[PDB]
Write a protein that binds this DNA or RNA. Structure first.
Length: 113
DNA sequence: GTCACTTCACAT
DNA sequence: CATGTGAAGTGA
């Protein structure tokens, strides 16, 4: 069931976003992590049901929160990886796992860019 | 040859 | 349980 969970998600998502997320990372900035993540972020804050189901959103305009299990699902990237990226591209974990949720920030990460 | 992730298989 | 390691891929 941890797979079909993927289905409903990717599926109920606009083909463009998906497409985005599917492309391997190149030197192109809107192809590496941050962007890809961030597009979802702001996409979601636009369609609440999904913001709930996936569990990825802005707490403040500087900090945000997610259920890794789930974002790493949408992004087709394993959980392990997803964490590995978060610290590797320097994101700050500022509140240990609180029942699935975590909140984060990154100096360049915010509002819209 | 380099990036920028990815994943594993175990460690902490 | 949640997270991180180092080495070893893979295709931009």
């Amino acid at each position: 069931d941890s797979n079909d969970l993927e289905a409903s998600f990717t599926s109920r998502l606009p083909p463009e976003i998906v497409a985005a997320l599917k492309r391997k990372s190149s030197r192109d900035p809107n192809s590496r992590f941050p962007r890809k993540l961030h597009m979802l972020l702001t996409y979601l804050a636009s369609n609440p049901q999904l913001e709930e189901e996936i569990g990825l959103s802005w707490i403040s305009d500087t900090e945000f929160k997610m259920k890794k299990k789930n974002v790493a699902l949408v992004m087709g990237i394993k959980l392990n990886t997803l964490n590995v990226n978060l610290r590797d591209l320097a994101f700050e974990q500022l509140q240990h796992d609180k029942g699935g949720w975590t909140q984060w920030k990154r100096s360049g990460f915010t509002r819209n860019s």
